Amino acid sequence: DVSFRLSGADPSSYGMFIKDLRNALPHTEKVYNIPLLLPSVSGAGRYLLMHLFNYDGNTITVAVDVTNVYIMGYLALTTSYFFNEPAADLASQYVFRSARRKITLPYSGNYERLQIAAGKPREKIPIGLPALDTAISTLLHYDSTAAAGALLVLIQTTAEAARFKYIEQQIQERAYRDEVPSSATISLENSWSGLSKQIQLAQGNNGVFRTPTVLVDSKGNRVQITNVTSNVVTSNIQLLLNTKNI
Ligand SMILES: *[C@@H]1O[C@H](CO)[C@@H](O[C@@H]2O[C@H](CO)[C@@H](O)[C@H](O)[C@H]2NC(C)=O)[C@H](O)[C@H]1NC(C)=O
Ligand SMILES: Nc1nc2[nH]cnc2c(=O)[nH]1
């Protein structure tokens, strides 16, 4: 398991947590020096448990699929909560077995569905450590509409920051003040699969992408990534989704 406490939290301990999280994902191989996540894992070993404590010490335990860093559900005191999707029900056979009650949320866990349930796109939802603390508190008391917004924050602070160094840095900047995500942050979140695939395909091709990836950068300018020599590839992306899942 991995842990993170918001009480006394600063940019450095947050950094330690994301490092712990990356190290907890198993991998057998590296492509261009980037851990390549596994095709699959059987049984309970497929799930990593994250324990998060809000400022006041209350806690929730979150289950993550180690093959794709997707959040499947969480435990709050004695009630477990799972997304409404096949992979999450599969996950319920292996974690939080001692939960007294199991609730299935009225949505699946993809951004499209979470944004509809929340009533706002994530372009309009502030993120940061203070926002993570509020999210943990919101999740302790069941409300499907408020939970959708809390999950959008939780996902970006923990799964997305693990996938990209830039997003991890964006969160460290928001350690004491929340701020909506930049356009580059959203573009990055949307291209993880695309990037992961082109980096894997670039191998037998001199490091050149079969088809270019279109992103929006920090200063706000559109851009094309065509080879593994680019910044995104050399210092941004930290984990690769296996092609057998794309
Ligand atoms: C690899 O990506 C780099 C950008 O990261 C590209 O290099 C550019 O390539 C040509 C000349 O090599 C120029 O027209 C571009 O403006 C270069 N940009 C730079 C140096 O910032 C290029 O797309 C890729 N390299 C190869 C060999 O395909
Ligand atoms: N549930 C979950 N959903 C996502 N939707 C987009 N990315 C993620 C993730 O990392 N976990």
Q: Convert the chain into a string of H (helix), E (strand) and C (coil).
A: CEEEECCCCCHHHHHHHHHHHHHCCCEEEEECCEEEECCCCCHHHHEEEEEEECCCCCEEEEEEECCCCEEEEEEECCEEEECCCHHHHHHCCCCCCCCCEEEECCCCCCHHHHHHHHCCCHHHCCECHHHHHHHHHHHCCCCHHHHHHHHHHHHHHHHHHHHEHHHHHHHHHCCCCCECCCHHHHHHHHHHHHHHHHHHHHHHHCCEEEEEEEEECCCCCEEEEEECCCHHHHHHECCECCHHHC
CATH number at residue 182: 4.10.470.10
Counting ligand 1 atoms within 8 A of each CB, the residue from 199, 214, 227 with the most, and so the one to mutate, is: 227
Identify the domain containing residue 233 by its residue range: 163-246
Alpha-carbon gap, residue 33 to 45, rounded angstroms: 25
Check 85, 160, 168, 189 and give the catalytic one: 160
- What's the CA-to-centroid distance between 211 and ligand 1, angstroms? 15
127 and 223 together in one domain: no
CATH number at residue 81: 3.40.420.10
148 and 100 together in one domain: yes
Q: How would you label 64-95 residue by residue, b for 16+ Cβ within 10 Å and e otherwise? A: bbbbbbbbbbbbbeeebbbbebebbeebbeeb
Q: Ligand 2 pocket: which residues have CB below 6 Å?
A: 69-71, 109-111, 155, 159
57 and 170 together in one domain: no
96 and 29 together in one domain: yes
Q: Which of 162, 189, 213 is the last residue of a domain?
A: 162
Tell me whether strands 2-5 and 47-53 are parallel, antiparallel or unpaired. Answer: parallel
Beta carbon of 104 within 6 Å of any ligand 1 atom: no
| Chain position carrying tokens 């509020």 | 134
Number of domains making up the chain: 2
Counting ligand 1 atoms within 8 A of each CB, the residue from 210, 225, 229 with the most, and so the one to mutate, is: 229
Ligand in nearest proximity to the CA of 111: 2
Beta carbon of 230 within 6 Å of any ligand 1 atom: yes
Q: Which of 162, 179, 209 is the last residue of a domain?
A: 162
Ligand 2 atom closest to the Cα of residue 158 is 10
Ligand 1 atom closest to the Cα of residue 227 is 1
139 and 39 together in one domain: yes
Q: Which of 137, 162, 187 is the last residue of a domain?
A: 162
146 and 189 together in one domain: no
148 and 87 together in one domain: yes
199 and 102 together in one domain: no
Specify the experimental method: X-ray
- What's the CA-to-centroid distance between 195 and ligand 2, angstroms? 16
Resolution (angstroms) stands at: 2.2
Ligand in nearest proximity to the CA of 206: 1
- What's the CA-to-centroid distance between 219 and ligand 1, angstroms? 19
Active site residue 160: yes
